[PDB]
């Protein structure tokens, strides 16, 4: 839990302590003494001529806990100067004790899901156009798919913005502002709202997958109720229930542990305010998936291989409910170190990024009802 901001603060305090000393410092009062100084890295006391100076390894160093007992060295060398060499315009320094004794993996995970979210984003805006454009396709089922399609789009865009904000808040322009101790994007509410939008857009996607499962389960439970009433509840559960734990998370993340635009999960306990409600959506769609598959096998064997049809229906139902998540969902970050973490991150990110693509292809493009609407339209267009 290192920090740039705490490091720079400590530097100024270390700046202060020795900077105070160099004024108040009692004179060596031995001639041939070496003038004391502060070289932006260490405070060097006046040293006796010809002999080396052993100085405490700076406590402001980020990795300084590693080694309490280190030292930096220079030499008075008895002319009142210090050692210098050709090709160097500085007083010889020896830091070799005090130094700090995968980008590509993370980059590979990034490249995967950036293609996945881009392909999902493209296929989902041209799949919502088909559902919205055709009036015959309008129905309570397609209304729920439209909100789910939009929920993926908000999840895809919020990721694109969030890779951009992480770029903004770790930029060579930004850091130099933060060394200079001046204000940075990181201290703005502009970035904290980006990573509060990314919690809502992720959590709304998980709760619109839940609405898809709950609606399908109520149609197949032979349960008939008000449609007008039921749809208003579903819209307020997909879009509104996420607010009931994303907003409290923002309240807690603002009062407690405000840092890093909220990018870093410092406590790993307030991070449960988002994880547990999401795992409730993950759990229920797995239970709904099992019940729906049991209903399908009952229908299939009532017609007396059924495993080509059963496998097709199982694989078609997985993107709609997001059940690829249960495999690694209970593999909680806390318990997920080492290569396991890689596998958890790879499978989840790669599948979720492409999940919007599956649902667009399966429930819009290859839908027989949708294909019928296109064939009907082409022939009508031919007549003019």
């Amino acid at each position: 839990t290192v920090s740039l901001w705490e490091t720079v603060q400590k530097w100024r305090e270390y700046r202060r302590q020795c900077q105070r000393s160099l004024t108040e410092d009692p004179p060596p009062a031995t001639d041939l003494f070496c003038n004391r100084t502060f070289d932006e890295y260490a405070c060097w006391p006046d040293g006796e001529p010809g002999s080396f100076v052993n100085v405490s390894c700076p406590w402001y160093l980020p990795w300084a806990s590693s080694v309490p007992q280190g030292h930096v060295y220079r030499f008075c060398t008895a002319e009142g100067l210090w050692l210098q060499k050709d090709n160097s315009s500085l007083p010889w320094r020896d830091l070799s004790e005090c130094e700090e004794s995968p980008e590509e993996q993370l980059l590979f995970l990034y490249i995967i899901y950036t293609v996945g979210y881009a392909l999902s984003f493209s296929a989902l805006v041209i799949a919502s156009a088909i559902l919205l454009g055709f009036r015959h396709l309008h129905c309570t089922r397609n209304y729920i798919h439209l909100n789910l399609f939009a929920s993926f789009i908000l999840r895809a865009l919020s990721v694109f913005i969030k890779d951009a904000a992480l770029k903004w808040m770790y930029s060579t322009a930004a850091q130099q502002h933060q060394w200079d101790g001046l204000l940075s994007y990181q201290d703005s509410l502009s970035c904290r709202l980006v990573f509060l939008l990314m919690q809502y857009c992720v959590a709304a996607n998980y709760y619109w997958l839940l609405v898809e499962g709950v609606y399908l389960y109520t149609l197949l439970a032979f349960s008939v109720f008000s449609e007008q009433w039921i749809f208003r509840l579903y819209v307020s559960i997909g879009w509104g229930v996420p607010l009931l734990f994303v907003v409290p998370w923002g309240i807690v993340k603002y009062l407690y542990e405000d840092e890093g635009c909220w990018t870093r999960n410092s406590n790993m306990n307030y991070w449960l305010i988002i994880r547990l409600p999401i795992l409730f959506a993950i759990g229920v769609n797995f239970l709904i998936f099992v019940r729906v598959i049991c209903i399908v096998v009952s229908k299939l064997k009532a017609n007396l291989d059924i495993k080509c049809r059963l496998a097709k229906s199982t694989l078609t139902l997985i993107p709609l409910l997001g059940t690829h998540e249960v495999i690694f969902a209970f593999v909680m970050d806390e318990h997920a170190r080492g290569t396991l973490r890689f596998i958890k991150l790879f499978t989840e990110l790669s599948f979720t990024s492409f999940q919007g693509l599956m649902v667009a292809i399966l429930y819009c493009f290859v839908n027989n009802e949708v294909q019928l609407e296109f064939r009907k339209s082409w022939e009508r267009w031919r007549l003019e």
Binding site: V2, S3, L4, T7, V8, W11, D39, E40, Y41, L61, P62, W63, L90, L95, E100, E103, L106, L109, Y110, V159, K162, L166, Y170, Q175, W179, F195, M198, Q199, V202, A203, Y206, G260, T263, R264, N265, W271, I274, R275, I278, D333, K344, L345, E348, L349, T352
Partner: peptide, 30 residues
């Protein structure tokens, strides 16, 4: 969820690299 976890891992890595290029600037005379 995956996205948050990945973001916290890249965020932590970036913060540590940044804090370990502030120190490097200082050794370069700032």
């Amino acid at each position: 969820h995956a996205e948050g976890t990945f973001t916290s891992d890249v965020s932590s890595y970036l913060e540590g690299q940044a804090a370990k290029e502030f120190i490097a600037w200082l050794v370069r005379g700032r």
